[PDB]
Every structure is written in structure tokens, then in C-alpha cells.
Design a protein around this ligand. Sequence first.
Ligand SMILES: O=C(NO)C1=CCCCC1
Ligand SMILES: [Cl-]
Ligand SMILES: [Cl-]
Ligand SMILES: [K+]
Ligand SMILES: [K+]
Ligand SMILES: [Zn+2]
Length: 356
Amino acid sequence: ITGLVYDQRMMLHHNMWDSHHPELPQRISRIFSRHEELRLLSRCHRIPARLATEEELALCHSSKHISIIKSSEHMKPRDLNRLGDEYNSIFISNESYTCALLAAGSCFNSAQAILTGQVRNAVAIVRPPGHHAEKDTACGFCFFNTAALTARYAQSITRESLRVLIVDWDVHHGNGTQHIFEEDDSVLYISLHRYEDGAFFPNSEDANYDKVGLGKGRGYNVNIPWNGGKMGDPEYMAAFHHLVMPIAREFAPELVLVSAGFDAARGDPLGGFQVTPEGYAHLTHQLMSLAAGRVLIILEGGYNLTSISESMSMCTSMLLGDSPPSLDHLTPLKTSATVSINNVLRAHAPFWSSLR
Ligand SMILES: O=C(NO)C1=CCCCC1
Ligand SMILES: [Cl-]
Ligand SMILES: [Cl-]
Ligand SMILES: [K+]
Ligand SMILES: [K+]
Ligand SMILES: [Zn+2]
């Protein structure tokens, strides 16, 4: 059984000064509609959304940050525009807090359904996104770090050291996720992202391949940064073959979370990349070989409504057991992508014998 969570209430978060801002309410309704239209929805078991509790938010976030976002629910626009402008790349409406709570709670219910064996895997069609949110601040369209919270929630209902792999294939580095788990060996964070030598959002060298984790977490943070190329299926398949899958198998996760942004997709207005829907299907199908198939796909970014709808629907088709669609002939890797992969291999072979 494949679970699916979607709740139209998450559309209520909106940009009251720029109704065309790309992080649109209809991102989630469009993905849901495509699942209906392809007859995937009836093949899934519907999992309800719920609000995350403040106690759950505290698994990853500071009391100050929770308080400030909570207070926004009853702010007038003046307080809201001003507050949002204090963060890097955030807009806020009175419904934003509730929607961020529903995104997180939806994922908690989904992880619970997987970990109790009610479903084998699941897909969470949620917004606002999470992976840029830090312990103490909002960033990059994200209020609370849904994926990071879901990992800690999973631990809280199983055992504290449950091995959680987070694969973040959003085109942007999940700075918040990296930081939250940087000193933690129970949550392996693997991100692929457009980097451009630190020029691409979120504009930090924290996203480079040499950031392998800190303290107990050394080895448990894997950054795969792309430079100087319009990357696509060949580069992502190669990164999975040489890095993601060998490391993941060696870690032997008990739960896999995908920070599944679809902004590396062909057609995205921001990412500049060309991963296809069939590419995302293949990535999903590979991850299903881990953790006895216990995979939760969590929407992050992705801004071409058609691209994200087709791409996420193909992921759910894989979770349901459909056979992978055929990739196009894979061109030789862009030269810089080979360099990137080899840089990560050299950084991580000390920690992961499967890379040697
Ligand atoms: O998709 C994203 N993050 O995943 C973005 C964050 C802010 C800049 C624009 C896109
Ligand atoms: Cl960007
Ligand atoms: Cl120790
Ligand atoms: K990423
Ligand atoms: K980590
Ligand atoms: Zn993104």
C-alpha cells in the first residue's frame, strides 16, 4: 500500500502583495489533480493531515522562532509584510503558520503509517516547503523544517537512534536540514544541488562537498554540488550510482525521507536544470531498494506547475510498484559533473568504504 496526504487548507498560505509569486497555492492542487487525472489517487490510501503541535516543532526549532511565526496568525498586513521582509525570501499571510503546521503534521502521520506498517511508502503533497528553515529562523519560502521534524518525530515513535536517510533532490541546498543534523550520526543528509561555487541560492559555501559533518556527525553530511552545467538525468543517475546509493546502502537506513523539490526539473523557471519526470521516477525506484521500501516523498520546491505535477506523479507511480519509464539515451556527463562527483568521492571515501 502507498499512502498519500493532501489537504487543500495548505493552499491558504499566500502572498498578499504578489499573487504571482512562484510559491503558489496551486502548486499542491495541481499535483493532486495530476494524480487524479492519471488514476493514481484511487490506487493510494489517503492519510489525513493534522497540525503539528508546538511540542513537535520544538524537536528542531527554538522557542523564539516558534513564538514569532505563531504570532503572525493574528498580525495585520503591516506586521506581516514587515516581519516577512526580516527574513531571506519569505512572505507571510495570517494562514501561513497553520499551513506550515499542517505540512509538518501531514508528514508525521505519513511517517507513522509507514513505521507501523499501515502503508509501505507514501507521498506528501504539502506546502509551504521546509528545507531552508533553520532551528531559529525562516528562510527561502520555508517556516519549519518539515523533513527534519519528520525524522525526529519518527525517532520519537520508534527509538531515538532510528537511522533516517534524508535525500534532498530539490535544486537548492537544504541549509536548514544540513545544520539541524550536522552533528548527528543518526540522520544521514545527502543533498544534490546547483552550487555554482557558492553563487546559487542559498549563497553559502556550507553547500560545498567538503562539508562532511561535524563532531559525531562527521561523514553523515553529503553535499553533491553542481557547477557550470545544465545538469539533467545523466548527471543525477551518475550521482546516484557512484554516491547516493552506495553510501545509503552502507548506512542501512530504517526510514528514507525525500526532500523532493521538483525545481531541478526541465521547465522550472528558477532551477535552470533538465531532470525529466522519468528521471525522478528512476531516482525514486532506486531509493525504494532501501529501508525495506520505507520511503516518504515530501514536496519541497518546484515552480513549473506542469513539470512538478508530472514529476511528482511519476514518483508516486514508482511507489505504487509500476515499472520505471524509459530514460532517454544518457549523454556523456558534463565535464564539471564528473569533477563534482570525484570531489565528493574523495571527501567521503574516508567514512564510507563502499566508495573505495
Ligand atoms: O526553491 C527554493 N528553495 O528550495 C527557493 C528558495 C528561495 C529562492 C527561490 C527558490
Ligand atoms: Cl534561485
Ligand atoms: Cl561520542
Ligand atoms: K538539494
Ligand atoms: K547528519
Ligand atoms: Zn528549491
